[PDB]
Amino acid sequence: SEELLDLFNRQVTQEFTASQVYLSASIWFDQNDWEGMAAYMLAESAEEREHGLGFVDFANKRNIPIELQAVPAPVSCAEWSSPEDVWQSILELEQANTRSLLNLAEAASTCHDFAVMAFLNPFHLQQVNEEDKIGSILAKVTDENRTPGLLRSLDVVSF
Amino acid sequence: SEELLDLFNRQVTQEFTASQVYLSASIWFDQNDWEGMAAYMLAESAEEREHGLGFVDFANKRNIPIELQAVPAPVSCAEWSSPEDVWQSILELEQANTRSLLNLAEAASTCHDFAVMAFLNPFHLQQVNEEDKIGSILAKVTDENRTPGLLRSLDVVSF
Amino acid sequence: SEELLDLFNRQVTQEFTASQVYLSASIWFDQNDWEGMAAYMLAESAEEREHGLGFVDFANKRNIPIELQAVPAPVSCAEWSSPEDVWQSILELEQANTRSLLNLAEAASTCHDFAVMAFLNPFHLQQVNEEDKIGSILAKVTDENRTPGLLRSLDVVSF
Amino acid sequence: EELLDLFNRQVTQEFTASQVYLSASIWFDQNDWEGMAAYMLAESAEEREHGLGFVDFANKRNIPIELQAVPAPVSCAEWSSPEDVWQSILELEQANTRSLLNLAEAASTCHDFAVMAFLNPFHLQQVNEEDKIGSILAKVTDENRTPGLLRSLDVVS
Amino acid sequence: SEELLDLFNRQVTQEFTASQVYLSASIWFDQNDWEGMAAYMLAESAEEREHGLGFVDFANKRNIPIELQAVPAPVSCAEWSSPEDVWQSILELEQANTRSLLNLAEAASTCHDFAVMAFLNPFHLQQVNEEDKIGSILAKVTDENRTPGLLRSLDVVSF
Ligand SMILES: [Fe+3]
Ligand SMILES: [Fe+3]
Ligand SMILES: [Fe+3]
Ligand SMILES: [Fe+3]
Ligand SMILES: [Fe+3]
Ligand SMILES: [Fe+3]
Ligand SMILES: [Fe+3]
Ligand SMILES: [Fe+3]
Ligand SMILES: [Fe+3]
Ligand SMILES: [Fe+3]
Ligand SMILES: [Fe+3]
Ligand SMILES: [Fe+3]
Ligand SMILES: [Fe+3]
Ligand SMILES: [Fe+3]
Ligand SMILES: [Fe+3]
Ligand SMILES: [Fe+3]
Ligand SMILES: [Fe+3]
Ligand SMILES: [Fe+3]
Ligand SMILES: [Fe+3]
């Protein structure tokens, strides 16, 4: 019971942690003049914030008390020295959002909490699409960057 | 007091000097068949002329006498043998426009000339955006030109 | 700063003093059948009251207490005998308004009151425009009035 | 090529004229002739467009252009009334016309039919311009015979 | 006199010869799967036909008898083994159209035939723009083809 409350609460922190990692990725791309990839990251930073606010709003409706935790400093921007490194961290970040949601669904399932299971369904399916989209961008970036300059030519055109 | 008059007057010459450097860059790019970069430079040549005319118009309103100086021949087109060289001179040129405006703001500040400080504010912020935009283009051009031909393929698509 | 609060209060008084002086000019012009110059003066009497109202609204928001002072009786109308005299008094009035504003900005700058200085900026620039416009009308009035009846032909035309 | 040199000098002459027009705009604004000031500011932008048109044709025709300094205007020092300013501007347009005719004579000697064709609309624009300027100068010279009267007509044009 | 008739007549053959060379270039590009460059050539083939018909129409109006000559087989498509070779032949072809028009203008000039000189003026200026545009495309193609594959990537995007 309490475990469900705790995992709901942790989900909000995970989505806001992901919002800040995406903002860090936007900064790294703008600082290195990848304005197209920076705008994509900034849009995802706002979207993850929206995911967190949806969990807050449902929790309030369901009388699940939310206590906002610290949103950790992103520190993957330590590692990053090329756009591949940034997109690989973003892929790992979406995988962690997916695992957080599955853990939460498992707790709900154990509790027979059908309303929380229902609420999570569109997020499970969102995550499938997000991991697919980021996986695909990572593949494109890794392939284009085999030729000097070429990756730039595709921040400019796409994004 | 007089120093403020002189620096106002010099600002007009700096913006018209920059207008002519951008026209020289347009010529170098058209002569070398970079029609996209040439059209960007020609647009900036007109914009710097507009900055100079705004300083003339304010000076007339504020009874700061303007005496138009010679606009020097651009001679950076000596150096240029690749688009990187052109964009690097343009970056240096915007940095000199920014320094000219800051010197002018310092004189105004010393004189407690609040109207001239206010007038300069949108130009300080314009310059921040211009140095950022030219820095970013220079980075893109330097990276694309690591592969023969590739830079061309992006005059054509962007610009 | 007592100085800064008093000068803010004084600025409201100066804008309302100027409103009344413009209304006095409108009466002189209407009495002497210069209906075009009267309507100009009436529009400016309303604009200077809007300036004073702008200062009262910002003072209220910034917790600057406003004590409304008397708006003195205009005295120049006792001595005006031609349009040139009236326009010369309005130029002087505008020069006063600008001095009052620069005094207030000097007090704000000493107090490092960044918000008050930022509020004043559009008024600094408006005064450059108003002094230029009045000085140019005064110049046209003074030249046209060298031929009998010619200035009348220009209240009728412009205004 | 004296042809090449004259084509470069034409760019410099148009930008020289742009600056002389801007200097006339400033003398008029300083002296509260805002109407005549706006006419000269428009001409200053038009002359810069004539120079840009020359640069563009030279780039297409592979005529190398090397931008020269644009000399500071000096006729403002002597102006004391609008008639002086307008008289300098008529002299400036006569100089622009002469520069175009010198370029056209070299193109004709060279049998450069493309450059002669390119110049034709500029020869006709100069006729129109010298006419308009000579007409305004005549109107200003006549109106300024009565004190104040010229002013009364800046404000109405 | 007769020389003017002959050179008018030869101009029609030159424009129709150029129409067929452009059609040959379209075929070579379609056969080698350069559909963007093929469509440009086909458009120029129709345009040169239009230039020839304009000369026919003026000649009819001016009572210059036209006798249509054989339009020669294009045989530059012998040489061609890369798009650079095609564009270089097209540049040479526009240079020959320009020379044909200048020869014709010289004959008209000698004859003091002011109507034929006037008629040719827009064609002299068309040619300046055409040689500039083809020169520029040739430069782009020669530079892009320094990297395998890259030129293709710009038939697809431009054209
Ligand atoms: Fe997302
Ligand atoms: Fe997304
Ligand atoms: Fe999320
Ligand atoms: Fe996500
Ligand atoms: Fe700019
Ligand atoms: Fe720009
Ligand atoms: Fe500038
Ligand atoms: Fe700039
Ligand atoms: Fe006002
Ligand atoms: Fe006003
Ligand atoms: Fe006021
Ligand atoms: Fe006022
Ligand atoms: Fe003109
Ligand atoms: Fe001109
Ligand atoms: Fe002109
Ligand atoms: Fe064509
Ligand atoms: Fe074409
Ligand atoms: Fe043709
Ligand atoms: Fe052609």
Author numbering:
A (entry chain F), B (entry chain F), C (entry chain A), E (entry chain F): 1 to 159
D (entry chain B): 2 to 158
Question: What text comes from the article?
Answer:
A novel ferritin was recently found in Pseudo-nitzschia multiseries (PmFTN), a marine pennate diatom that plays a major role in global primary production and carbon sequestration into the deep ocean. Ferritin is a 24-mer that forms a hollow sphere, takes up soluble ferrous iron, oxidizes it at di-iron ferroxidase centers, and stores the iron oxide mineral in its central cavity. Sites A and B comprise the conserved ferroxidase active site, and site C forms a pathway leading toward the central cavity where iron storage occurs. The structures confirm the typical ferritin arrangement: 24 subunits assemble to form a hollow spherical shell.
To determine whether occupation of ferroxidase sites and site C is time-dependent, apo-PmFTN crystals were soaked for 5 min, 45 min, 4 h, and overnight in 2 mm ferrous sulfate. The latter two sites may serve as the nucleation site for formation of the mineral core. All but one of the crystals analyzed were of space group P23 with eight ferritin monomers in the asymmetric unit. A bridging oxygen atom is modeled between sites A and B and between sites B and C. A second solvent oxygen atom is coordinated to iron in site A. The bridging solvent molecule between sites A and B might be a bridging oxo group rather than a water molecule, building a diferric-oxo bridge as seen in other ferritins. Sample electron density for the overnight-soaked structure at the ferroxidase site including the bridging ligand is presented in Fig. 2D. Glu-130 adopts multiple conformations depending on the soaking time and is observed coordinated to iron atoms in site B and/or site C. In the overnight-soaked structure, Glu-130 is tilted toward the iron in site B, whereas in the 4-h-soaked structure, it is predominately coordinated to site C. The distance between the iron atoms in sites A and B is ∼3.8 Å in Fe, which decreases to ∼3.6 Å upon overnight soak.
